[PDB]
Amino acid sequence: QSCVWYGECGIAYGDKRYNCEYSGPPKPLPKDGYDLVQELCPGFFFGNVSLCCDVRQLQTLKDNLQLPLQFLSRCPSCFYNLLNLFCELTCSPRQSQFLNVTATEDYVDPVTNQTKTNVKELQYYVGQSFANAMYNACRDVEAPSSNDKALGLLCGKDADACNATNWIEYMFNKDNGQAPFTITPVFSDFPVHGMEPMNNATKGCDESVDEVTAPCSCQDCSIVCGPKPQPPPPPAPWTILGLDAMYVIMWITYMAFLLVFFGAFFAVWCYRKPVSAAFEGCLRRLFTRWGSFCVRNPGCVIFFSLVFITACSSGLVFVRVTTNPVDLWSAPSSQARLEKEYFDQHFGPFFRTEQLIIRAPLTDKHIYQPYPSGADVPFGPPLDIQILHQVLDLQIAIENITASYDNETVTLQDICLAPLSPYNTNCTILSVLNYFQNSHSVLDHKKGDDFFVYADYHTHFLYCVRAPASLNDTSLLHDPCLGTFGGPVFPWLVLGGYDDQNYNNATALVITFPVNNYYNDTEKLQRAQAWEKEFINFVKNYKNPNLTISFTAERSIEDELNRESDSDVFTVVISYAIMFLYISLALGHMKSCRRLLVDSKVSLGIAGILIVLSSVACSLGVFSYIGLPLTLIVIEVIPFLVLAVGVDNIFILVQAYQRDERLQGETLDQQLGRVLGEVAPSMFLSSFSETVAFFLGALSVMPAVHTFSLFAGLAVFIDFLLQITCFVSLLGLDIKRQEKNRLDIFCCVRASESCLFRFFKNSYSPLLLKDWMRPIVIAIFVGVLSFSIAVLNKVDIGLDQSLSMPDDSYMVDYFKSISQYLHAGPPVYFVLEEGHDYTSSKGQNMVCGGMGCNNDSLVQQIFNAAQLDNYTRIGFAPSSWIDDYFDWVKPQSSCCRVDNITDQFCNASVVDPACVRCRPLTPEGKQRPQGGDFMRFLPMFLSDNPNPKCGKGGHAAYSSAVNILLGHGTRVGATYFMTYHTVLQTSADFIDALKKARLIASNVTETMGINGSAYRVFPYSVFYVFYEQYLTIIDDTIFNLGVSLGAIFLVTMVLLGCELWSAVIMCATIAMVLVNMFGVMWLWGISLNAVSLVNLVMSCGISVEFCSHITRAFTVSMKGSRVERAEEALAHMGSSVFSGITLTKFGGIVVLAFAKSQIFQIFYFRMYLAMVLLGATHGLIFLPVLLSYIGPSV
Ligand SMILES: *[C@@H]1O[C@H](CO)[C@@H](O[C@@H]2O[C@H](CO)[C@@H](O)[C@H](O[C@@H]3O[C@H](CO)[C@@H](O)[C@H](O)[C@@H]3O)[C@H]2NC(C)=O)[C@H](O)[C@H]1NC(C)=O
Ligand SMILES: *[C@@H]1O[C@H](CO)[C@@H](O[C@H]2O[C@H](CO)[C@@H](O[C@H]3O[C@H](CO)[C@@H](O)[C@H](O)[C@@H]3O)[C@H](O)[C@H]2NC(C)=O)[C@H](O)[C@H]1NC(C)=O
Ligand SMILES: *[C@@H]1O[C@H](CO)[C@@H](O[C@@H]2O[C@H](CO)[C@@H](O)[C@H](O)[C@H]2NC(C)=O)[C@H](O)[C@H]1NC(C)=O
Ligand SMILES: *[C@@H]1O[C@H](CO)[C@@H](O[C@@H]2O[C@H](CO)[C@@H](O)[C@H](O)[C@H]2NC(C)=O)[C@H](O)[C@H]1NC(C)=O
Ligand SMILES: CC(C)CCC[C@@H](C)[C@H]1CC[C@H]2[C@@H]3CC=C4C[C@@H](O)CC[C@]4(C)[C@H]3CC[C@]12C
Ligand SMILES: *[C@@H]1O[C@H](CO)[C@@H](O)[C@H](O)[C@H]1NC(C)=O
Ligand SMILES: *[C@@H]1O[C@H](CO)[C@@H](O)[C@H](O)[C@H]1NC(C)=O
Ligand SMILES: *[C@@H]1O[C@H](CO)[C@@H](O)[C@H](O)[C@H]1NC(C)=O
Ligand SMILES: *[C@@H]1O[C@H](CO)[C@@H](O)[C@H](O)[C@H]1NC(C)=O
Ligand SMILES: *[C@@H]1O[C@H](CO)[C@@H](O)[C@H](O)[C@H]1NC(C)=O
Ligand SMILES: *[C@@H]1O[C@H](CO)[C@@H](O)[C@H](O)[C@H]1NC(C)=O
Ligand SMILES: *[C@@H]1O[C@H](CO)[C@@H](O)[C@H](O)[C@H]1NC(C)=O
Ligand SMILES: *[C@@H]1O[C@H](CO)[C@@H](O)[C@H](O)[C@H]1NC(C)=O
Ligand SMILES: *[C@@H]1O[C@H](CO)[C@@H](O)[C@H](O)[C@H]1NC(C)=O
């Protein structure tokens, strides 16, 4: 061996210098540019160097290689062979093996008069196996600001016919502008002229160059990426013979029942052609004695009753109302609530978002044509220049807003979050205008001279949607697109309406204004909401006819529900008035026209209304005293429920007295005591059954059911007591009044056999209980039960969180805009808890996504999830901090540089006096920082800023994501890896997203193998607390309904004696009511949520109020046969139960039908209507027939 050239003495043109000929042996290097040889081509560095090379040649290599490093450095094995062809081509130590100079001539020096020899031309021997593996490993790499191939800008022609030999000829040719002299390549693998060429090792785009540099992407290499992922779809229908499972299995249960049931009637019809009274008797005696006591002592009883009312109802001064949604819809000690508590303590709370979905309806799409060559690229309507100026005008106006509070201004600049503050203090605005940095100048600046423009905002937009984190364009524009706050703006967060990667076609512009949320501070939250109100008002009062804005503020759902929570008081007041009107007119039997206003019950009706409203106030006041806060659900379900139960008892008592004839020699207090003693066990049964039912129903962890259960239980109990003591006293007084002839309301101016009872005794009970009507009735009811049980498991789960908004609202428009345009959803944070190591080889392999780290690690699993993206609802890649930290700390990048004496961070833009690199540029230094070096360089990384010489830095993105626990060697605390969900439109989507995020977290926790259960991975998103209840709502429904029905069963089997048969008939009928309630639920499209479960547990308690009365009247009766007992029970009790609860509630719902609110009209009106008429129908048409057939003897 020998060298061929050294130095630069000649000059061609510009800075280009001809190499100076010298064919002696290779020189030991002067120790000056040792750093350069390890960056350009490290294959020569095994020191005792003896390289023929020169630092003035090396620095011109590095200067000319600027654009191939930028384009081709994405795929390391490609840029590795390119470096191997140049370093070796220029200054290899065995240069004479593969080179032979042909033409050379002398050069004259103006400095020393010694004539130097330039090298004008020569020939270069290149192997064929190097060029084929080189071109084939580099042909797939894409270019920046285009979808072309990167060879298309470096071959000198189209990328369809640049062969594996002509491209090398174009590179060595001076026609490009870089090569100082043309070199003629000759390609041959075999020795010619006895001289054999160079053939070193080659690596393709799939093989990695070193054990720490990850392989090439499949965007830039066609041999790494194989079959796509695919999930397995389970649909799960049984579908036996063509239609559903329960739909067919029930219809065969029905045909089997109807044939085995009516074939026994037509089979036999053609064949024939003491402990109870001991507890039920002491109660009767007690109520009779106490009833007489109350009629002959009215003053003491009414006084003590009023004192009780006042003492209990004085607790309304401490009334608190809960309106904050997390405490309402999320259990205080649930799993999701504990995860939210852990996240708010270590990383601070999730921010508040104010979006704005602007759209341009008048403008049409236009075409953009690149000047040199390239296919046409169409741009959507909002991406016109005029529309962008108007949106920029709108954004600068939203930043203006001041919104004074407590005589001081509270600006956007004060409340929004600027991640890297105070250095840069602007704040996060996520708008497509941040690519141009919110400046009319930068947006309006074009580069060129007439008849065509070289660059334009189309070119800038196209460059920055592909790579939004660059700090200079470096190709004909030379502008950054980082954004005024500093840190990237991702195109899927700021655009919508495009088609899957093609951001050119965008139809909407999304503009987000993140605002800080504060953890245990209330003054700041009042400041933030004070700004949001004015933001809402401004956007509503913004005219701009070219644009259609769909906006939202963080407090807007709460504001819409508090604005919607009025406008129906005009319906509820008229509802109660019409109810009271019926109570006053229907209680009194008319029986004559000249005696109307004396046998009238107006005063007694007023007394009934005051006892019911008074009961409401006593319930509210006792639980207000105790400290239980109210809710807006309670305020709509409590008057109605208490009205239902209380009014029915009032009718039972008053009509049971009116239809009673007074015995001879019996005075009034004895008669009223007798009637109360004979009617009171049934009322006691109903009231006690509901109180025990509701109170026992206060065991769930659901806040709506918990507070409702407490309030409703106390109200039913207090209302029963208040009736039993005060209403019989007022009833005695009103009988005294009517017997002393005195007229009604004004003052002092001086048996019944009611119209309903003559219909129920004479026409309805005999007809219904005939032998040709009972099989028809039983057939119809088992058929309706069969339908309801069949369509049971097709009921929806959850609430749409939209139908809860008015129809004239802007939030409905915002939800339409989301569903029609948006592509990203709420962010997910995968929090790895405190306790992980991070300063060890295995501890880093379990968490990384990169080269040496595992294939089942955390970052890799979220990446796989994002490759699926429809089964698992995680839309995008993770954005880890540990990969970035490793990329930052590696010696090649050279962002890291420490001060020599102070051990302080020397910045990337600094004058360079003596600060040296942190990690040594040796083979050991290439590796990951596994020891104590990790924790010595991590805070400096998290404090580094986005410098143009370094890259992105770790302050704007990871400062809140990494917690460092100072003192005792400084370990790492809890950290997160944040990605984004897919657009979620319905409750099914939200539950699916929750479930599968939990699944990924549980998977990672399994693979990590923790000794015991010291820590675990968990996902946090904002809606998890609101949607975690629906993962156990089915077992909650089972437990609540089963426990309430068992409580009813037990209370019935205790109070009725020990008769198990009456209890089983009553319980089976209320279970029928619940199953048919679910059928009507499915049929009207009501969904199962936290409102519907409350309404079902209420229906289970009104079902008793019908049943209990009828079944007790049948049971305690001493007639002969079942038919006469059924018609007797029907007549006697059903005349009062149809007039008391049914007609009142029916009048209420039919007047309530003009409601004007959607939430009310779906979950309250329909459920109440269903409950009332279903229970009425069931009781009065199904207890007679079922008791007639299989009722309990005595
Ligand atoms: C979403 O945006 C993409 C942006 O590429 C649209 O694709 C392209 O469609 C436009 C429609 O008018 C074509 O002009 C583009 O190019 C054509 O380019 C070839 C190049 O060989 C020429 O020979 C043709 O004469 C023509 O000019 C076309 N570009 C590519 C790369 O396919 C896409 O249509 C759009 N989607 C919708 C729904 O509008
Ligand atoms: C994730 O989201 C969807 C499934 O959840 C996919 O989308 C869909 O788009 C429509 C339905 O809106 C359907 O495609 C129809 O039109 C195409 C035209 O080529 C037909 O081939 C197809 O038979 C349908 O009539 C599909 O149901 C679905 N995608 C397709 C192929 O259009 C979406 O693609 C999916 N993405 C991924 C990566 O899973
Ligand atoms: C081309 O291949 C040769 C043959 O392997 C390489 O030469 C050796 O390089 C290693 C790397 O450090 C040295 O340890 C050996 O001592 C070298 N052997 C010799 C000179 O006989 C050479 O490095 C390759 N070219 C490049 C640029 O890597
Ligand atoms: C956002 O921060 C940037 C710098 O972090 C501020 O800077 C400049 O904006 C002015 C016009 O206001 C331009 O003339 C300069 O070119 C920018 N300076 C640099 C060095 O980039 C900017 O004012 C801040 N505010 C807004 C609203 O953009
Ligand atoms: C547009 C494309 C083709 C440009 C990429 C090729 C460039 C960067 C390459 C091709 C030929 C190379 C040159 C070949 C010869 C010499 C003389 C030597 O003493 C110093 C390096 C120097 C000056 C090289 C610098 C890099 C170089 C100019
Ligand atoms: C280039 O690579 C392709 C696969 O991408 C292969 O089919 C072809 O044979 C290769 N050509 C060579 C090595 O000349
Ligand atoms: C609104 O913002 C503009 C931005 O240039 C500023 O000049 C002006 O002072 C702001 N305040 C007003 C109008 O109160
Ligand atoms: C606002 O508060 C300050 C006290 O900080 C007080 O001096 C000032 O008079 C107040 N202004 C008004 C208009 O109330
Ligand atoms: C980005 O602009 C040019 C592009 O060639 C580059 O030379 C320059 O160094 C970069 N800017 C800074 C501040 O480093
Ligand atoms: C609406 O668009 C037209 C055309 O781009 C423009 O002239 C006008 O100023 C725009 N703005 C309005 C009406 O506020
Ligand atoms: C994942 O785990 C190891 C690491 O390479 C290996 O044994 C296993 O085959 C890998 N699985 C796949 C599918 O690559
Ligand atoms: C770089 O460091 C110097 C000195 O510490 C400091 O003045 C300068 O603001 C830093 N620049 C950044 C962080 O962009
Ligand atoms: C760093 O400090 C050591 C000893 O303090 C010294 O030997 C070395 O030359 C210094 N390097 C630089 C670049 O100042
Ligand atoms: C979690 O792991 C199980 C087996 O360990 C696998 O079936 C399931 O698909 C994984 N879930 C993911 C990757 O979301």
mmCIF file of N, CA and C in Angstrom, residues 271-344:
data_model
loop_
_atom_site.group_PDB
_atom_site.id
_atom_site.type_symbol
_atom_site.label_atom_id
_atom_site.label_comp_id
_atom_site.label_asym_id
_atom_site.label_seq_id
_atom_site.Cartn_x
_atom_site.Cartn_y
_atom_site.Cartn_z
ATOM 1 N N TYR A 271 -113.502 -33.896 30.074
ATOM 2 C CA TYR A 271 -113.609 -35.089 30.916
ATOM 3 C C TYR A 271 -114.865 -35.058 31.789
ATOM 4 N N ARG A 272 -115.145 -33.902 32.409
ATOM 5 C CA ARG A 272 -116.341 -33.718 33.235
ATOM 6 C C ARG A 272 -117.643 -33.657 32.428
ATOM 7 N N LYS A 273 -117.572 -33.516 31.109
ATOM 8 C CA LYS A 273 -118.774 -33.497 30.292
ATOM 9 C C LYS A 273 -118.967 -34.844 29.607
ATOM 10 N N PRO A 274 -103.120 -19.670 63.738
ATOM 11 C CA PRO A 274 -103.376 -19.326 65.131
ATOM 12 C C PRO A 274 -102.286 -18.404 65.632
ATOM 13 N N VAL A 275 -101.105 -18.520 65.027
ATOM 14 C CA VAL A 275 -99.995 -17.664 65.420
ATOM 15 C C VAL A 275 -100.124 -16.312 64.736
ATOM 16 N N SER A 276 -100.819 -16.305 63.591
ATOM 17 C CA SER A 276 -101.080 -15.097 62.817
ATOM 18 C C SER A 276 -101.968 -14.113 63.567
ATOM 19 N N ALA A 277 -103.107 -14.606 64.089
ATOM 20 C CA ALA A 277 -104.088 -13.820 64.852
ATOM 21 C C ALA A 277 -103.555 -13.239 66.162
ATOM 22 N N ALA A 278 -102.489 -13.813 66.730
ATOM 23 C CA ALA A 278 -101.941 -13.240 67.953
ATOM 24 C C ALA A 278 -101.166 -11.960 67.672
ATOM 25 N N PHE A 279 -100.580 -11.835 66.479
ATOM 26 C CA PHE A 279 -99.870 -10.598 66.170
ATOM 27 C C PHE A 279 -100.759 -9.637 65.382
ATOM 28 N N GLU A 280 -101.765 -10.172 64.688
ATOM 29 C CA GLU A 280 -102.667 -9.336 63.898
ATOM 30 C C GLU A 280 -103.844 -8.856 64.753
ATOM 31 N N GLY A 281 -103.896 -9.287 66.007
ATOM 32 C CA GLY A 281 -105.006 -8.900 66.853
ATOM 33 C C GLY A 281 -104.587 -7.885 67.895
ATOM 34 N N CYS A 282 -103.336 -7.964 68.354
ATOM 35 C CA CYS A 282 -102.836 -6.949 69.275
ATOM 36 C C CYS A 282 -102.588 -5.625 68.557
ATOM 37 N N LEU A 283 -102.246 -5.683 67.262
ATOM 38 C CA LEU A 283 -102.064 -4.480 66.443
ATOM 39 C C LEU A 283 -103.374 -3.736 66.218
ATOM 40 N N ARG A 284 -104.430 -4.490 65.867
ATOM 41 C CA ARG A 284 -105.794 -3.990 65.684
ATOM 42 C C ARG A 284 -106.295 -3.284 66.941
ATOM 43 N N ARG A 285 -106.030 -3.884 68.119
ATOM 44 C CA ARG A 285 -106.457 -3.340 69.409
ATOM 45 C C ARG A 285 -105.721 -2.044 69.711
ATOM 46 N N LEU A 286 -104.398 -2.037 69.453
ATOM 47 C CA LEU A 286 -103.534 -0.865 69.623
ATOM 48 C C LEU A 286 -103.980 0.304 68.754
ATOM 49 N N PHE A 287 -104.261 0.036 67.468
ATOM 50 C CA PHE A 287 -104.681 1.094 66.554
ATOM 51 C C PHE A 287 -106.072 1.617 66.873
ATOM 52 N N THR A 288 -106.992 0.728 67.297
ATOM 53 C CA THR A 288 -108.336 1.125 67.718
ATOM 54 C C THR A 288 -108.298 2.036 68.938
ATOM 55 N N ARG A 289 -107.554 1.621 69.993
ATOM 56 C CA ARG A 289 -107.412 2.407 71.225
ATOM 57 C C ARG A 289 -106.746 3.744 70.964
ATOM 58 N N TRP A 290 -105.675 3.732 70.156
ATOM 59 C CA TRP A 290 -104.940 4.951 69.871
ATOM 60 C C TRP A 290 -105.747 5.880 68.962
ATOM 61 N N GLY A 291 -106.568 5.311 68.067
ATOM 62 C CA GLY A 291 -107.454 6.102 67.225
ATOM 63 C C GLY A 291 -108.543 6.805 68.007
ATOM 64 N N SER A 292 -109.112 6.121 69.000
ATOM 65 C CA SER A 292 -110.106 6.749 69.868
ATOM 66 C C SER A 292 -109.422 7.859 70.674
ATOM 67 N N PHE A 293 -108.246 7.546 71.216
ATOM 68 C CA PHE A 293 -107.424 8.517 71.945
ATOM 69 C C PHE A 293 -107.215 9.779 71.128
ATOM 70 N N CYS A 294 -106.841 9.621 69.864
ATOM 71 C CA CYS A 294 -106.586 10.775 69.021
ATOM 72 C C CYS A 294 -107.837 11.558 68.639
ATOM 73 N N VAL A 295 -109.003 10.918 68.574
ATOM 74 C CA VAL A 295 -110.210 11.688 68.270
ATOM 75 C C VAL A 295 -110.777 12.386 69.510
ATOM 76 N N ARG A 296 -110.482 11.892 70.714
ATOM 77 C CA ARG A 296 -111.013 12.578 71.891
ATOM 78 C C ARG A 296 -109.988 13.460 72.593
ATOM 79 N N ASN A 297 -108.791 13.586 72.041
ATOM 80 C CA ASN A 297 -107.756 14.502 72.528
ATOM 81 C C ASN A 297 -107.093 15.318 71.401
ATOM 82 N N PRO A 298 -107.811 16.090 70.527
ATOM 83 C CA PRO A 298 -107.168 16.725 69.339
ATOM 84 C C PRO A 298 -106.070 17.755 69.568
ATOM 85 N N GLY A 299 -106.217 18.607 70.579
ATOM 86 C CA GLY A 299 -105.282 19.669 70.911
ATOM 87 C C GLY A 299 -103.853 19.259 71.196
ATOM 88 N N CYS A 300 -103.656 18.332 72.156
ATOM 89 C CA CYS A 300 -102.335 17.820 72.532
ATOM 90 C C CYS A 300 -101.610 17.179 71.353
ATOM 91 N N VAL A 301 -102.309 16.287 70.623
ATOM 92 C CA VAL A 301 -101.749 15.556 69.478
ATOM 93 C C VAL A 301 -101.320 16.527 68.361
ATOM 94 N N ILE A 302 -102.212 17.461 67.943
ATOM 95 C CA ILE A 302 -101.932 18.403 66.850
ATOM 96 C C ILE A 302 -100.784 19.352 67.260
ATOM 97 N N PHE A 303 -100.721 19.751 68.553
ATOM 98 C CA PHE A 303 -99.670 20.632 69.051
ATOM 99 C C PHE A 303 -98.318 19.948 68.997
ATOM 100 N N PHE A 304 -98.237 18.709 69.524
ATOM 101 C CA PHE A 304 -96.989 17.941 69.496
ATOM 102 C C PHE A 304 -96.556 17.614 68.071
ATOM 103 N N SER A 305 -97.531 17.375 67.190
ATOM 104 C CA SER A 305 -97.268 17.111 65.773
ATOM 105 C C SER A 305 -96.659 18.334 65.072
ATOM 106 N N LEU A 306 -97.215 19.515 65.347
ATOM 107 C CA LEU A 306 -96.687 20.777 64.798
ATOM 108 C C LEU A 306 -95.301 21.114 65.341
ATOM 109 N N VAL A 307 -95.080 20.853 66.636
ATOM 110 C CA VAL A 307 -93.777 21.040 67.277
ATOM 111 C C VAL A 307 -92.730 20.133 66.628
ATOM 112 N N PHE A 308 -93.112 18.874 66.335
ATOM 113 C CA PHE A 308 -92.258 17.914 65.625
ATOM 114 C C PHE A 308 -91.922 18.394 64.214
ATOM 115 N N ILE A 309 -92.943 18.881 63.480
ATOM 116 C CA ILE A 309 -92.816 19.448 62.126
ATOM 117 C C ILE A 309 -91.830 20.618 62.108
ATOM 118 N N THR A 310 -91.968 21.549 63.071
ATOM 119 C CA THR A 310 -91.101 22.727 63.168
ATOM 120 C C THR A 310 -89.665 22.344 63.538
ATOM 121 N N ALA A 311 -89.503 21.478 64.565
ATOM 122 C CA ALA A 311 -88.202 20.979 65.030
ATOM 123 C C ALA A 311 -87.434 20.232 63.944
ATOM 124 N N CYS A 312 -88.144 19.510 63.075
ATOM 125 C CA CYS A 312 -87.508 18.755 62.004
ATOM 126 C C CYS A 312 -87.289 19.625 60.786
ATOM 127 N N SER A 313 -88.202 20.541 60.516
ATOM 128 C CA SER A 313 -88.160 21.352 59.322
ATOM 129 C C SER A 313 -87.339 22.608 59.491
ATOM 130 N N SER A 314 -86.829 22.869 60.697
ATOM 131 C CA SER A 314 -85.918 23.987 60.901
ATOM 132 C C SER A 314 -84.513 23.707 60.390
ATOM 133 N N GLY A 315 -84.187 22.464 60.026
ATOM 134 C CA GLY A 315 -82.898 22.156 59.435
ATOM 135 C C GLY A 315 -82.675 22.634 58.013
ATOM 136 N N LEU A 316 -83.669 23.227 57.339
ATOM 137 C CA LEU A 316 -83.479 23.812 56.005
ATOM 138 C C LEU A 316 -82.596 25.060 55.963
ATOM 139 N N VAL A 317 -82.173 25.635 57.088
ATOM 140 C CA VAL A 317 -81.228 26.739 57.072
ATOM 141 C C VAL A 317 -79.836 26.284 56.656
ATOM 142 N N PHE A 318 -79.469 25.027 56.924
ATOM 143 C CA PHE A 318 -78.165 24.467 56.573
ATOM 144 C C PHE A 318 -78.169 23.757 55.224
ATOM 145 N N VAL A 319 -79.069 24.124 54.307
ATOM 146 C CA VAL A 319 -79.210 23.363 53.070
ATOM 147 C C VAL A 319 -78.054 23.659 52.111
ATOM 148 N N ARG A 320 -77.415 22.594 51.640
ATOM 149 C CA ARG A 320 -76.365 22.700 50.641
ATOM 150 C C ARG A 320 -76.824 21.927 49.426
ATOM 151 N N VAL A 321 -76.568 22.446 48.236
ATOM 152 C CA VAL A 321 -76.932 21.744 47.017
ATOM 153 C C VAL A 321 -75.633 21.428 46.276
ATOM 154 N N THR A 322 -75.502 20.181 45.848
ATOM 155 C CA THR A 322 -74.344 19.692 45.113
ATOM 156 C C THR A 322 -74.630 19.814 43.626
ATOM 157 N N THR A 323 -73.792 20.558 42.906
ATOM 158 C CA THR A 323 -73.944 20.709 41.463
ATOM 159 C C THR A 323 -72.706 20.279 40.699
ATOM 160 N N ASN A 324 -71.564 20.123 41.369
ATOM 161 C CA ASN A 324 -70.317 19.660 40.770
ATOM 162 C C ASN A 324 -70.453 18.215 40.275
ATOM 163 N N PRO A 325 -70.292 17.973 38.960
ATOM 164 C CA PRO A 325 -70.541 16.641 38.365
ATOM 165 C C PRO A 325 -69.729 15.437 38.827
ATOM 166 N N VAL A 326 -68.467 15.595 39.256
ATOM 167 C CA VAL A 326 -67.653 14.454 39.693
ATOM 168 C C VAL A 326 -68.239 13.788 40.947
ATOM 169 N N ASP A 327 -68.599 14.577 41.974
ATOM 170 C CA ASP A 327 -69.240 14.056 43.188
ATOM 171 C C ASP A 327 -70.643 13.504 42.901
ATOM 172 N N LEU A 328 -71.346 14.066 41.908
ATOM 173 C CA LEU A 328 -72.671 13.561 41.557
ATOM 174 C C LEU A 328 -72.577 12.192 40.889
ATOM 175 N N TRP A 329 -71.846 12.101 39.783
ATOM 176 C CA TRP A 329 -71.804 10.858 39.008
ATOM 177 C C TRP A 329 -70.691 9.873 39.310
ATOM 178 N N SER A 330 -69.830 10.211 40.255
ATOM 179 C CA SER A 330 -68.728 9.328 40.609
ATOM 180 C C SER A 330 -68.719 9.002 42.094
ATOM 181 N N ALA A 331 -68.622 7.717 42.416
ATOM 182 C CA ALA A 331 -68.580 7.305 43.805
ATOM 183 C C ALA A 331 -67.337 7.839 44.492
ATOM 184 N N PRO A 332 -67.418 8.299 45.772
ATOM 185 C CA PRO A 332 -66.263 8.922 46.450
ATOM 186 C C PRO A 332 -65.048 8.052 46.724
ATOM 187 N N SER A 333 -65.212 6.735 46.651
ATOM 188 C CA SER A 333 -64.129 5.818 46.963
ATOM 189 C C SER A 333 -64.010 4.760 45.892
ATOM 190 N N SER A 334 -64.415 5.087 44.674
ATOM 191 C CA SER A 334 -64.300 4.171 43.561
ATOM 192 C C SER A 334 -62.855 4.111 43.095
ATOM 193 N N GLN A 335 -62.589 3.081 42.283
ATOM 194 C CA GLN A 335 -61.268 2.827 41.710
ATOM 195 C C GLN A 335 -60.786 3.982 40.834
ATOM 196 N N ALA A 336 -61.661 4.486 39.948
ATOM 197 C CA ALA A 336 -61.344 5.599 39.052
ATOM 198 C C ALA A 336 -61.124 6.891 39.818
ATOM 199 N N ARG A 337 -61.851 7.072 40.916
ATOM 200 C CA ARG A 337 -61.683 8.235 41.769
ATOM 201 C C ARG A 337 -60.339 8.187 42.488
ATOM 202 N N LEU A 338 -59.919 6.997 42.932
ATOM 203 C CA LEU A 338 -58.598 6.843 43.545
ATOM 204 C C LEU A 338 -57.463 7.073 42.538
ATOM 205 N N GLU A 339 -57.653 6.641 41.280
ATOM 206 C CA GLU A 339 -56.672 6.904 40.219
ATOM 207 C C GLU A 339 -56.585 8.392 39.910
ATOM 208 N N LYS A 340 -57.732 9.088 39.920
ATOM 209 C CA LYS A 340 -57.759 10.531 39.702
ATOM 210 C C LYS A 340 -57.101 11.274 40.853
ATOM 211 N N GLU A 341 -57.272 10.777 42.081
ATOM 212 C CA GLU A 341 -56.603 11.330 43.256
ATOM 213 C C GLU A 341 -55.097 11.152 43.204
ATOM 214 N N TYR A 342 -54.622 10.029 42.678
ATOM 215 C CA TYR A 342 -53.188 9.807 42.569
ATOM 216 C C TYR A 342 -52.620 10.695 41.480
ATOM 217 N N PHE A 343 -53.360 10.892 40.386
ATOM 218 C CA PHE A 343 -52.846 11.701 39.289
ATOM 219 C C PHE A 343 -52.814 13.173 39.659
ATOM 220 N N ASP A 344 -53.824 13.682 40.373
ATOM 221 C CA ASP A 344 -53.815 15.099 40.744
ATOM 222 C C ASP A 344 -52.755 15.447 41.781
#
